[PDB]
Amino acid sequence: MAHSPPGHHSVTGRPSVNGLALAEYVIYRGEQAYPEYLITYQIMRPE
Protein backbone atom coordinates (compact mmCIF):
# COMPACT_ATOMS: atom_id res chain seq x y z
CA MET A 1 0.00 0.00 0.00
CA ALA A 2 1.29 3.48 -1.03
CA HIS A 3 1.76 6.46 1.30
CA SER A 4 -0.53 9.49 1.16
CA PRO A 5 0.82 12.68 -0.41
CA PRO A 6 3.19 14.55 1.93
CA GLY A 7 1.26 16.55 4.50
CA HIS A 8 -2.00 14.82 3.43
CA HIS A 9 -4.15 11.96 4.85
CA SER A 10 -6.10 11.03 1.72
CA VAL A 11 -6.82 11.83 -1.89
CA THR A 12 -10.00 13.24 -3.39
CA GLY A 13 -10.45 12.11 -7.02
CA ARG A 14 -12.89 14.52 -8.61
CA PRO A 15 -14.26 13.82 -12.11
CA SER A 16 -13.86 16.96 -14.22
CA VAL A 17 -15.61 15.85 -17.48
CA ASN A 18 -18.77 14.05 -16.40
CA GLY A 19 -20.43 16.74 -14.28
CA LEU A 20 -22.89 14.23 -12.84
CA ALA A 21 -20.12 11.91 -11.56
CA LEU A 22 -19.42 12.38 -7.86
CA ALA A 23 -16.06 12.11 -6.08
CA GLU A 24 -14.01 9.04 -5.23
CA TYR A 25 -11.68 8.99 -2.24
CA VAL A 26 -8.53 7.08 -1.37
CA ILE A 27 -7.05 6.33 2.04
CA TYR A 28 -3.71 4.62 2.68
CA ARG A 29 -4.32 3.36 6.21
CA GLY A 30 -7.07 0.79 6.95
CA GLU A 31 -7.64 2.37 10.37
CA GLN A 32 -9.13 5.46 8.66
CA ALA A 33 -12.35 3.60 7.71
CA TYR A 34 -15.02 1.78 9.76
CA PRO A 35 -17.56 -0.50 7.99
CA GLU A 36 -20.67 0.89 9.64
CA TYR A 37 -23.56 -0.55 7.58
CA LEU A 38 -23.85 -3.75 5.54
CA ILE A 39 -26.42 -3.42 2.78
CA THR A 40 -27.92 -6.45 0.95
CA TYR A 41 -29.62 -5.69 -2.37
CA GLN A 42 -30.45 -6.56 -5.97
CA ILE A 43 -30.09 -4.24 -8.93
CA MET A 44 -33.49 -3.76 -10.64
CA ARG A 45 -34.13 -4.25 -14.39
CA PRO A 46 -35.38 -0.98 -15.93
CA GLU A 47 -39.04 -1.16 -17.12
Added chain:
Amino acid sequence: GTILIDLSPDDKEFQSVEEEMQSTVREHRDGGHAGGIFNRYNILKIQKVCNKKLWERYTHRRKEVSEENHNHANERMLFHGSPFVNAIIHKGFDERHAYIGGMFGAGIYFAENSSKSNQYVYGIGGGTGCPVHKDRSCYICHRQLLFCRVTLGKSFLQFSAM
Protein backbone atom coordinates in the same frame (compact mmCIF):
# COMPACT_ATOMS: atom_id res chain seq x y z
CA GLY B 1 -16.05 -9.91 17.80
CA THR B 2 -18.34 -8.55 15.05
CA ILE B 3 -22.11 -8.66 15.49
CA LEU B 4 -24.65 -7.60 12.90
CA ILE B 5 -27.90 -5.92 13.96
CA ASP B 6 -30.81 -5.77 11.50
CA LEU B 7 -32.46 -2.42 11.04
CA SER B 8 -36.22 -2.27 10.59
CA PRO B 9 -37.50 -0.73 7.32
CA ASP B 10 -39.78 1.42 9.53
CA ASP B 11 -36.70 2.88 11.25
CA LYS B 12 -35.54 6.33 10.15
CA GLU B 13 -31.94 5.06 10.13
CA PHE B 14 -32.78 2.33 7.57
CA GLN B 15 -34.66 4.85 5.45
CA SER B 16 -31.78 7.32 5.45
CA VAL B 17 -29.31 4.69 4.28
CA GLU B 18 -31.65 3.43 1.57
CA GLU B 19 -32.17 7.01 0.33
CA GLU B 20 -28.41 7.63 0.17
CA MET B 21 -28.09 4.37 -1.84
CA GLN B 22 -30.94 5.12 -4.28
CA SER B 23 -30.23 8.84 -4.70
CA THR B 24 -26.62 8.31 -5.76
CA VAL B 25 -27.15 5.91 -8.65
CA ARG B 26 -25.87 7.39 -11.92
CA GLU B 27 -25.19 6.28 -15.50
CA HIS B 28 -21.73 4.91 -16.13
CA ARG B 29 -19.56 5.40 -19.24
CA ASP B 30 -19.23 1.61 -19.77
CA GLY B 31 -22.96 1.37 -20.57
CA GLY B 32 -23.37 -1.08 -17.60
CA HIS B 33 -20.55 -3.47 -18.53
CA ALA B 34 -19.01 -3.72 -15.05
CA GLY B 35 -21.96 -3.09 -12.72
CA GLY B 36 -25.06 -3.90 -14.75
CA ILE B 37 -27.92 -1.94 -16.25
CA PHE B 38 -30.17 -0.35 -13.61
CA ASN B 39 -31.62 2.92 -12.33
CA ARG B 40 -32.46 1.77 -8.79
CA TYR B 41 -32.02 -1.05 -6.29
CA ASN B 42 -34.21 -3.47 -4.42
CA ILE B 43 -32.90 -3.12 -0.83
CA LEU B 44 -33.34 -6.48 0.98
CA LYS B 45 -31.59 -5.79 4.30
CA ILE B 46 -29.48 -3.18 6.12
CA GLN B 47 -27.39 -4.31 9.12
CA LYS B 48 -25.40 -2.26 11.60
CA VAL B 49 -21.88 -3.61 12.01
CA CYS B 50 -20.72 -3.59 15.65
CA ASN B 51 -17.17 -4.42 16.64
CA LYS B 52 -15.67 -2.72 19.74
CA LYS B 53 -12.06 -3.53 18.87
CA LEU B 54 -12.41 -2.24 15.27
CA TRP B 55 -14.26 0.86 16.46
CA GLU B 56 -11.50 1.70 18.94
CA ARG B 57 -8.87 1.19 16.24
CA TYR B 58 -10.86 3.64 14.05
CA THR B 59 -11.40 6.38 16.72
CA HIS B 60 -7.76 6.26 17.81
CA ARG B 61 -6.59 6.92 14.24
CA ARG B 62 -9.33 9.57 13.81
CA LYS B 63 -7.97 11.42 16.84
CA GLU B 64 -4.38 11.35 15.43
CA VAL B 65 -5.57 12.62 12.05
CA SER B 66 -7.84 15.27 13.62
CA GLU B 67 -4.96 16.68 15.71
CA GLU B 68 -2.57 16.70 12.73
CA ASN B 69 -5.20 18.55 10.68
CA HIS B 70 -5.81 21.26 13.30
CA ASN B 71 -8.77 19.61 15.01
CA HIS B 72 -10.62 18.60 11.82
CA ALA B 73 -11.19 14.86 11.10
CA ASN B 74 -13.04 15.62 7.82
CA GLU B 75 -15.14 12.50 8.34
CA ARG B 76 -17.58 11.35 5.65
CA MET B 77 -20.05 8.48 5.01
CA LEU B 78 -19.02 6.74 1.76
CA PHE B 79 -19.73 3.53 -0.19
CA HIS B 80 -17.37 0.59 -0.63
CA GLY B 81 -17.90 -2.40 -2.93
CA SER B 82 -15.51 -5.32 -2.80
CA PRO B 83 -15.25 -9.09 -3.15
CA PHE B 84 -13.72 -9.02 0.40
CA VAL B 85 -16.73 -7.49 2.20
CA ASN B 86 -17.13 -10.62 4.43
CA ALA B 87 -13.49 -10.32 5.50
CA ILE B 88 -13.74 -6.57 6.04
CA ILE B 89 -16.65 -6.68 8.48
CA HIS B 90 -14.80 -9.25 10.65
CA LYS B 91 -11.17 -8.16 10.45
CA GLY B 92 -11.42 -4.47 9.49
CA PHE B 93 -9.87 -2.73 6.52
CA ASP B 94 -6.16 -3.30 5.73
CA GLU B 95 -3.69 -3.52 2.81
CA ARG B 96 -5.31 -6.72 1.42
CA HIS B 97 -8.35 -4.54 0.57
CA ALA B 98 -6.43 -1.91 -1.43
CA TYR B 99 -6.81 -1.39 -5.19
CA ILE B 100 -3.15 -1.53 -6.14
CA GLY B 101 -3.80 -0.39 -9.72
CA GLY B 102 -6.22 2.42 -8.92
CA MET B 103 -5.83 5.69 -10.87
CA PHE B 104 -5.47 7.83 -7.71
CA GLY B 105 -2.77 5.52 -6.25
CA ALA B 106 -2.49 2.19 -4.40
CA GLY B 107 -4.90 2.57 -1.49
CA ILE B 108 -8.44 1.77 -0.32
CA TYR B 109 -11.11 3.42 -2.51
CA PHE B 110 -14.56 4.77 -1.53
CA ALA B 111 -17.32 6.42 -3.61
CA GLU B 112 -20.03 9.02 -3.19
CA ASN B 113 -22.00 7.26 -5.95
CA SER B 114 -23.38 3.91 -4.74
CA SER B 115 -23.44 2.75 -8.40
CA LYS B 116 -19.63 3.32 -8.66
CA SER B 117 -19.04 0.98 -5.67
CA ASN B 118 -21.54 -1.51 -7.23
CA GLN B 119 -19.00 -1.89 -10.08
CA TYR B 120 -16.54 -3.63 -7.65
CA VAL B 121 -18.89 -6.06 -5.86
CA TYR B 122 -17.78 -8.93 -8.11
CA GLY B 123 -14.17 -7.67 -8.42
CA ILE B 124 -12.22 -5.15 -10.54
CA GLY B 125 -14.28 -4.32 -13.64
CA GLY B 126 -17.10 -6.47 -12.23
CA GLY B 127 -14.93 -9.57 -12.69
CA THR B 128 -16.97 -12.31 -14.33
CA GLY B 129 -20.20 -11.21 -12.58
CA CYS B 130 -22.24 -13.26 -10.15
CA PRO B 131 -20.92 -16.76 -9.23
CA VAL B 132 -24.16 -18.56 -10.17
CA HIS B 133 -24.89 -17.01 -13.59
CA LYS B 134 -21.57 -15.28 -14.55
CA ASP B 135 -23.65 -12.19 -15.28
CA ARG B 136 -22.35 -8.70 -14.31
CA SER B 137 -25.94 -7.44 -14.71
CA CYS B 138 -27.57 -10.30 -12.77
CA TYR B 139 -31.01 -9.24 -11.42
CA ILE B 140 -31.49 -12.43 -9.34
CA CYS B 141 -28.40 -12.80 -7.19
CA HIS B 142 -28.00 -10.85 -3.93
CA ARG B 143 -25.23 -8.25 -3.73
CA GLN B 144 -23.67 -6.55 -0.70
CA LEU B 145 -22.17 -3.02 -0.30
CA LEU B 146 -20.68 -1.28 2.76
CA PHE B 147 -21.60 2.24 3.81
CA CYS B 148 -18.60 3.35 5.81
CA ARG B 149 -17.36 6.07 8.13
CA VAL B 150 -14.14 7.40 6.57
CA THR B 151 -11.61 9.89 8.04
CA LEU B 152 -10.17 12.08 5.21
CA GLY B 153 -8.10 14.60 7.20
CA LYS B 154 -6.25 16.92 4.85
CA SER B 155 -7.26 15.58 1.47
CA PHE B 156 -5.24 16.15 -1.70
CA LEU B 157 -7.53 17.29 -4.51
CA GLN B 158 -6.88 15.46 -7.78
CA PHE B 159 -8.99 16.31 -10.80
CA SER B 160 -9.41 13.41 -13.16
CA ALA B 161 -10.34 13.31 -16.78
CA MET B 162 -13.32 10.96 -16.07
